[PDB]
């Protein structure tokens, strides 16, 4: 009913990941940026605003969650936009129809909303960022930048599996400084992924408080970017694969009492509960905000697992695991 551009951020606490829905006032068209596999929240919000999801875009090939972009194209018959700024080996493969490979300085329109594609390598070689201008409202200046894992609140992305990426990052940071200081920064990840809890920042504020914007010695920049960065959890290589090549469409599935106990098993209860009594061979991964961060070190994508917890707790963990592209929970068992 209101004619102002629609914008809403969606945050997943386990993944520490931010996706966004933008929608055009005039035409009803809408786009999801960096979608997760479960599209239901975006859909319900679009319904409530009278918007139709017709587009989806992605900042880069994610290492820490399973993208829902192919699901958007297939289930919603939407046009999708992904980076074409890659070499022949590490670029997107098996993409559906309606897939547009975008390059630096390309413009994407979502109704009257204009997004300019900026190639911002460093975190990954194909990383792109999207500069939004609300042209439907007559704006002649940009409003904000969907920065993916290029720029975070109070930090910047690390080159994933380094000097080559670090050097790319330094250059991307130098060129992004040219954008107006009043633009908002809409990052792809936040606190828990260090990273700010505040879901958004501004370019000018980052220039004042983000170390990456004040360090102009390339060698010092590279050293600080790469130095003492923890080794990535084991599930990252698998995510890169499923995001580069695609996986099965997302569907919920039943998790009933386990038929075979000889499986890698994770106990979802509190550390206090587990400590108070637990079955042997099971690994305690409490289903709190650190669940994914912890479970990635033990999760084998080529094996079925059982979970220990009550039916409801198990169904929540099951869902969260599907968000990192794991659809193979074989069953569950109650704690004794």
Task: Report if residue 126 touches Fe ion, rule: CB under 5 A.
Answer: no
Least distance in Å: CB of 193 to its own copies?
A: 8
Structure tokens at 110: 């979502």
Q: Which is nearer to Fe ion, 7 or 236 (CB)?
A: 236
Q: Categorise residue 44: left if φ over 0, alpha if ψ from -120 to 50, beta otherwise.
A: alpha
By three-state DSSP, how is residue 204 classified? helix
Is 122:166 a contact under the CB 8 Å cutoff?
Answer: yes
Query: For residues 28 and 112, what is the distance between their CA atoms, to the nearest angstrom?
Result: 10
Q: Which of 253, 261, 297, 304 is in the footprint of its own copies by CB under 8 A?
A: 253
By three-state DSSP, how is residue 159 classified? coil
Task: Report if residue 305 touches its own copies, rule: CB under 8 A.
Answer: no
Query: For residues 279 and 286, what is the distance between their CA atoms, to the nearest angstrom?
Result: 15
Binding range to its own copies, per CB under 8 A, among 135-143, 162-170, 222-230, 233-241? 135-143
Task: Report if residue 181 touches Cl ion, rule: CB under 5 A.
Answer: yes
Helix, strand, coil % in the chain, rounded to nearest 5:
25, 25, 50
Touching its own copies, residues 87-126 (CB under 8 A): none
Binding range to its own copies, per CB under 8 A, among 61-69, 217-225, 229-237, 255-263? 255-263
CA-wise closest residue to 32 among 71, 84, 88: 71
Least distance in Å: CB of 244 to its own copies?
A: 24
Least distance in Å: CB of 151 to Fe ion?
A: 12
Is 310:295 a contact under the CB 8 Å cutoff?
Answer: no
Least distance in Å: CB of 157 to Fe ion?
A: 6
Task: Report if residue 49 touches its own copies, rule: CB under 8 A.
Answer: yes
Task: Report if residue 2 touches its own copies, rule: CB under 8 A.
Answer: yes
Q: Which is nearer to its own copies, 93 or 271 (CB)?
A: 271
Least distance in Å: CB of 216 to Fe ion?
A: 25
Please, what's the b/e burial string for 178-194 (b: 16 or more CB within 10 A of its CB; e: otherwise)? Answer: ebeeebbbbbbbbbbbe
CA-wise closest residue to 128 among 155, 108, 154, 146: 146
Instruction: Give the list of residues 6+ apart from residue 302 with CB closer than 8 angstroms, or none.
Output: none
Question: Judged by CB under 5 A, how many residues of this single chain contact Mg ion?
Answer: 3
Touching its own copies, residues 160-199 (CB under 8 A): 180-184, 191-192, 194-199
Is 209:215 a contact under the CB 8 Å cutoff?
Answer: no
Least distance in Å: CB of 315 to its own copies?
A: 9
Touching Mg ion, residues 264-303 (CB under 5 A): 280
Point out which residues bind Cl ion (CB under 5 A): 180-181
Point out which residues bind Mg ion (CB under 5 A): 280, 304, 328
């Amino acid at each position: 009913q209101s004619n102002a551009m629609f914008f809403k951020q969606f945050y997943d606490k386990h993944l520490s990941q931010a996706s966004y829905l933008i929608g055009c006032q005039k035409t009803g068209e809408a786009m999801i940026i960096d979608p997760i596999r479960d599209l239901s929240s975006y859909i319900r919000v679009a319904d409530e605003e009278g918007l139709t999801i017709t587009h989806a875009a992605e900042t880069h090939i994610h290492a820490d969650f399973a993208s829902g972009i192919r699901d958007v194209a297939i289930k919603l018959n939407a046009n999708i936009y992904v980076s074409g700024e890659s070499d022949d080996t590490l670029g997107y493969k098996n993409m559906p129809n309606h897939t547009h490979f975008v390059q630096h300085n390309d413009d994407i329109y979502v109704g009257n909303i204009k997004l300019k594609v900026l190639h911002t390598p460093g975190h990954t070689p194909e990383s792109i960022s999207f500069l939004l201008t609300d042209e439907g409202a007559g704006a002649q200046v940009p409003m904000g930048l969907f920065s993916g894992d290029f720029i975070f609140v109070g930090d910047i992305g690390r080159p994933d599996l380094s000097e080559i990426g670090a050097k790319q990052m330094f250059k991307s940071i130098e060129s992004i400084k040219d954008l107006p200081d009043y633009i908002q920064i809409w990052p792809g990840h936040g606190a828990g992924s260090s990273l700010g809890a505040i879901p958004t920042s501004t370019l000018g504020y980052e220039k004042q408080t983000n170390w990456a914007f004040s360090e102009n010695n390339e060698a010092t920049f590279i050293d600080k970017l790469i130095s003492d960065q923890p080794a990535p959890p084991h599930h990252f290589a698998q995510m890169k694969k499923i995001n580069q090549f695609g996986m099965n469409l997302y569907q919920p599935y039943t998790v009933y009492p386990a038929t075979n106990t000889n499986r890698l098993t994770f106990d979802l209860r509190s550390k206090e509960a587990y400590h108070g009594g637990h079955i042997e061979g099971t690994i305690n991964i409490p289903y709190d905000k650190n669940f994914i961060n912890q479970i990635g070190w033990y999760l084998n994508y080529d094996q079925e697992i059982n979970l220990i917890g009550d039916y409801h707790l198990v169904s929540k963990a099951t869902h969260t695991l599907q968000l990192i592209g794991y659809d193979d929970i074989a069953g569950y068992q109650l704690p004794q």
